[PDB]
Enzyme design. Structure first.
Site, PDB file in Angstrom:
ATOM      1  N   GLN A  57     150.117  77.258  18.520  1.00 26.04           N
ATOM      2  CA  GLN A  57     151.416  76.785  18.007  1.00 26.04           C
ATOM      3  C   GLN A  57     152.516  77.748  18.484  1.00 26.04           C
ATOM      4  O   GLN A  57     152.271  78.980  18.619  1.00 26.04           O
ATOM      5  CB  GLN A  57     151.464  76.746  16.492  1.00 26.04           C
ATOM      6  CG  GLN A  57     150.647  75.765  15.806  1.00 26.04           C
ATOM      7  CD  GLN A  57     150.840  75.860  14.290  1.00 26.04           C
ATOM      8  OE1 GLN A  57     151.950  75.767  13.799  1.00 26.04           O
ATOM      9  NE2 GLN A  57     149.755  76.054  13.559  1.00 26.04           N
TER      10      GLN A  57
HETATM   11  N1  LIG Z   1     138.866  63.086  21.044  1.00 20.71           N
HETATM   12  C1  LIG Z   1     138.788  64.406  21.148  1.00 20.71           C
HETATM   13  N2  LIG Z   1     139.286  65.206  20.164  1.00 20.71           N
HETATM   14  C2  LIG Z   1     139.160  66.565  20.303  1.00 20.71           C
HETATM   15  C3  LIG Z   1     138.546  67.135  21.394  1.00 20.71           C
HETATM   16  N3  LIG Z   1     138.582  68.461  21.226  1.00 20.71           N
HETATM   17  C4  LIG Z   1     139.199  68.736  20.086  1.00 20.71           C
HETATM   18  N4  LIG Z   1     139.569  67.570  19.495  1.00 20.71           N
HETATM   19  C5  LIG Z   1     140.285  67.352  18.220  1.00 20.71           C
HETATM   20  O1  LIG Z   1     141.629  67.764  18.379  1.00 20.71           O
HETATM   21  C6  LIG Z   1     142.095  68.398  17.197  1.00 20.71           C
HETATM   22  C7  LIG Z   1     142.479  69.840  17.506  1.00 20.71           C
HETATM   23  O2  LIG Z   1     141.355  70.635  17.838  1.00 20.71           O
HETATM   24  P1  LIG Z   1     141.347  72.234  17.636  1.00 20.71           P
HETATM   25  O3  LIG Z   1     140.093  72.803  18.156  1.00 20.71           O
HETATM   26  O4  LIG Z   1     141.710  72.504  16.188  1.00 20.71           O
HETATM   27  O5  LIG Z   1     142.634  72.636  18.544  1.00 20.71           O
HETATM   28  P2  LIG Z   1     143.286  74.117  18.845  1.00 20.71           P
HETATM   29  O6  LIG Z   1     143.492  74.372  20.298  1.00 20.71           O
HETATM   30  O7  LIG Z   1     142.268  75.098  18.459  1.00 20.71           O
HETATM   31  O8  LIG Z   1     144.595  74.131  18.000  1.00 20.71           O
HETATM   32  P3  LIG Z   1     145.314  75.486  17.376  1.00 20.71           P
HETATM   33  O9  LIG Z   1     144.248  76.378  16.712  1.00 20.71           O
HETATM   34  O10 LIG Z   1     146.306  74.907  16.449  1.00 20.71           O
HETATM   35  O11 LIG Z   1     145.889  76.203  18.502  1.00 20.71           O
HETATM   36  C8  LIG Z   1     140.963  68.284  16.175  1.00 20.71           C
HETATM   37  O12 LIG Z   1     141.200  67.162  15.355  1.00 20.71           O
HETATM   38  C9  LIG Z   1     139.732  68.108  17.016  1.00 20.71           C
HETATM   39  O13 LIG Z   1     138.692  67.431  16.344  1.00 20.71           O
HETATM   40  C10 LIG Z   1     138.029  66.308  22.367  1.00 20.71           C
HETATM   41  O14 LIG Z   1     137.482  66.720  23.375  1.00 20.71           O
HETATM   42  N5  LIG Z   1     138.152  64.948  22.224  1.00 20.71           N
END
Ligand SMILES: Nc1nc2c(ncn2[C@@H]2O[C@H](COP(=O)(O)OP(=O)(O)OP(=O)(O)O)[C@@H](O)[C@H]2O)c(=O)[nH]1
Ligand SMILES: [Mg+2]
Length: 165
Positions: A57
């Site tokens: 973020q």
């Molecule tokens: N359809 C789909 N959804 C995904 C995939 N990878 C992650 N998500 C979804 O996307 C959303 C964000 O995933 P996170 O792993 O929390 O993302 P992040 O990069 O860690 O986000 P921050 O910690 O806020 O920086 C979640 O609802 C996950 O379930 C994917 O490969 N396919």
């Protein structure tokens, strides 16, 4: 023995990917936006990881550079289905790559063109073109398509990363 920074915008799938690399018993079932950052451990064929899993973020991107001196490797994650936000991702990648604590170290960068399963998703080849990864000359890099919910593509990245180390 191997310290990794996991970078990318919020909603890219960073924490989902890191979670999937863990043993089944160690995996979280409800992944929420990362609050600042977390430190996780996972294990590969013969490599032990400490991962600085940062929040992507805007509020917390200021923290990234604090941890650069202990990235021996970087995993940079892209939401393949979001071309508009990919412009912001590229800006941050370019800042990362030019940062004083990054620019002169041959640190391996693994990219994941994640969310490959979504209808609007760009291929890993297309992502590499859009981010201009060809321009990274002084660091080893690799890009994979991934569906982090399923785990597809993660093995190839981890295997590439292990070879580099
Ligand atoms: N359809 C789909 N959804 C995904 C995939 N990878 C992650 N998500 C979804 O996307 C959303 C964000 O995933 P996170 O792993 O929390 O993302 P992040 O990069 O860690 O986000 P921050 O910690 O806020 O920086 C979640 O609802 C996950 O379930 C994917 O490969 N396919
Ligand atoms: Mg996260």
């Amino acid at each position: 023995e191997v310290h990794v920074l996991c970078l990318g915008l919020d909603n890219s799938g960073k924490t989902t990917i890191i979670n999937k690399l863990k043993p089944s018993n160690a995996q979280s079932q409800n992944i929420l936006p990362t609050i600042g950052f977390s430190i996780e451990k996972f294990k590969s064929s013969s490599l032990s990881f400490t991962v600085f899993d940062m929040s992507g973020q805007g509020r917390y991107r200021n923290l990234w550079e604090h941890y650069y001196k202990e990235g021996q490797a970087i995993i940079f994650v892209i939401d393949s289905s979001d071309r508009l936000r990919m412009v912001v991702a590229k800006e941050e990648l370019d800042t990362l790559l030019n940062h004083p604590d990054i620019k002169h170290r041959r640190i391996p960068i693994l990219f994941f063109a994640n969310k490959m399963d979504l209808r609007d998703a760009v291929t890993s080849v297309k992502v590499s073109q859009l981010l201009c990864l060809e321009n990274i000359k002084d660091k080893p890099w690799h890009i994979c398509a991934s569906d982090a919910i399923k785990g597809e593509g993660l093995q190839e990245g981890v295997d590439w990363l292990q070879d580099q180390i």
